[PDB]
Design an enzyme around this catalytic site. Structure first.
Site, mmCIF file in Angstrom:
data_model
loop_
_atom_site.group_PDB
_atom_site.id
_atom_site.type_symbol
_atom_site.label_atom_id
_atom_site.label_comp_id
_atom_site.label_asym_id
_atom_site.label_seq_id
_atom_site.Cartn_x
_atom_site.Cartn_y
_atom_site.Cartn_z
ATOM 1 N N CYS A 1 -1.117 0.533 -14.105
ATOM 2 C CA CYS A 1 -1.392 0.620 -12.683
ATOM 3 C C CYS A 1 -2.552 1.602 -12.555
ATOM 4 O O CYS A 1 -3.523 1.492 -13.311
ATOM 5 C CB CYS A 1 -0.139 1.023 -11.888
ATOM 6 S SG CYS A 1 0.924 2.276 -12.715
ATOM 7 N N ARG B 1 4.218 2.252 -10.873
ATOM 8 C CA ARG B 1 4.551 0.834 -10.883
ATOM 9 C C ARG B 1 4.708 0.324 -12.304
ATOM 10 O O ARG B 1 5.560 -0.533 -12.572
ATOM 11 C CB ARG B 1 3.469 0.023 -10.166
ATOM 12 C CG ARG B 1 3.131 0.565 -8.817
ATOM 13 C CD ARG B 1 1.902 -0.132 -8.245
ATOM 14 N NE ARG B 1 1.596 0.465 -6.958
ATOM 15 C CZ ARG B 1 0.604 0.075 -6.178
ATOM 16 N NH1 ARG B 1 -0.182 -0.925 -6.564
ATOM 17 N NH2 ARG B 1 0.408 0.682 -5.015
ATOM 18 N N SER B 2 3.861 0.804 -13.221
ATOM 19 C CA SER B 2 3.973 0.389 -14.610
ATOM 20 C C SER B 2 5.343 0.714 -15.157
ATOM 21 O O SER B 2 5.922 -0.078 -15.910
ATOM 22 C CB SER B 2 2.922 1.090 -15.478
ATOM 23 O OG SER B 2 1.644 0.659 -15.109
ATOM 24 N N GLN C 1 7.705 7.273 -10.443
ATOM 25 C CA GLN C 1 7.134 8.440 -9.772
ATOM 26 C C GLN C 1 7.881 8.872 -8.512
ATOM 27 O O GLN C 1 7.678 10.000 -8.054
ATOM 28 C CB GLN C 1 5.661 8.174 -9.406
ATOM 29 C CG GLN C 1 4.707 8.228 -10.579
ATOM 30 C CD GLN C 1 3.236 8.057 -10.172
ATOM 31 O OE1 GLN C 1 2.746 6.937 -10.025
ATOM 32 N NE2 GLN C 1 2.531 9.175 -9.998
ATOM 33 N N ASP D 1 0.824 -1.206 0.000
ATOM 34 C CA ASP D 1 0.000 0.000 0.000
ATOM 35 C C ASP D 1 0.858 1.255 0.000
ATOM 36 O O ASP D 1 0.502 2.261 -0.622
ATOM 37 C CB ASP D 1 -0.915 0.014 1.226
ATOM 38 C CG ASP D 1 -2.256 -0.650 0.977
ATOM 39 O OD1 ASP D 1 -2.792 -0.535 -0.147
ATOM 40 O OD2 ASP D 1 -2.782 -1.274 1.921
#
Ligand SMILES: [Cl-]
Ligand SMILES: [Cl-]
Ligand SMILES: [Cl-]
Ligand SMILES: [Cl-]
Ligand SMILES: [Cl-]
Length: 278
Positions: free
Chosen positions: A213, A219-220, A260, A179
């Protein structure tokens, strides 16, 4: 390469390395993404595909989807990075899969995370409850699912209701990304990446694997960056000449904002370091 990682850790300059990537990253226009008629097709008004690399829908309607073709020439692999579909863009999403001839869809988020919705329920959870996308004339049926401890692989059948043609789509769902922050260990993530590879989904005989994502950059980006670097390490005569920063900057010519956080950059290095051993 683990030497560079060690020096960056034993100095705490990940924030520095990351901000340099942000400063050097390409900027290209996103005129179409920002048109008023596309307001409700973007999950995040700050994450838009570049005009030159956006995926265009083929049907007689607005051609816009928030998705980018990342074409890695030296590694000889293409990816489609896209946001998590919205309730009104699931038909567009599957239209893109159909039109681009993709065989695999890689999802790196849960639909709900920390109690918030990151993505529409864009595939059917029950065999008997298929999804019909009347706007794009597609039907999507859950055929079977193989649920594992850290990921799920679903066999989907996408049917073009216009031609009655059907295709098997593999849905690779990494379900255990934390998370907050990044996985302490890249083991699961790498096992997942290798499962996607051995499925044949990223084979050059198919359309590009679709990776998403929530915004399709965080995450991608980690997924595509790790996969591409591992491909480059298997090809080059000097595998340690693979420069992860240079690769990420190359991918950022195709979609803004890939990776990111400094943590995501650090995790990417760690994933490539550990994935190279195998
Ligand atoms: Cl939809
Ligand atoms: Cl989920
Ligand atoms: Cl968690
Ligand atoms: Cl390089
Ligand atoms: Cl950024």
């Amino acid at each position: 390469m683990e030497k560079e990682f060690e020096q960056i850790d034993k100095s705490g300059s990940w924030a520095a390395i990351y901000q340099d990537i942000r400063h050097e990253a390409s900027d290209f226009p996103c005129r179409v993404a920002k048109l008023p008629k596309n307001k409700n097709r973007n999950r995040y008004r700050d994450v838009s595909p570049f005009d030159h690399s956006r995926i265009k829908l083929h049907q007689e309607d607005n051609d816009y989807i928030n998705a980018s073709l990342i074409k890695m020439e030296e590694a000889q692999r293409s990816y489609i990075l896209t946001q998590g579909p919205l309730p009104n863009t699931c038909g567009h999403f599957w239209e893109m899969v159909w039109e681009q001839k993709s065989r695999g869809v890689v999802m790196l988020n849960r639909v709900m995370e920390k109690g918030s919705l990151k993505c529409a329920q864009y595939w059917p959870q029950k065999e008997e409850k298929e999804m019909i996308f009347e706007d794009t004339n597609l039907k999507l049926t859950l055929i079977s699912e193989d649920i594992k401890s850290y990921y799920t692989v679903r066999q989907l059948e996408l049917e073009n209701l216009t031609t009655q043609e059907t295709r098997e789509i593999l849905h690779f769902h990494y379900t255990t990304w934390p998370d907050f922050g990044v996985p302490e260990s890249p083991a699961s993530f790498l096992n997942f990446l290798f499962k996607v590879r051995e499925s044949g989904s990223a084979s050059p005989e198919h359309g590009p694997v679709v990776v998403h994502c929530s915004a399709g950059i965080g995450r991608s980006g980690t997924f595509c960056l790790a996969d591409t670097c591992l491909l480059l390490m298997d090809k080059r005569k000097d595998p340690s000449s693979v420069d992860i920063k240079k690769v990420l900057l190359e991918m950022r010519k195709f979609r803004m904002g890939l990776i990111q956080t400094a943590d995501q950059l650090r995790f990417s290095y760690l994933a490539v370091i550990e994935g190279a051993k195998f």
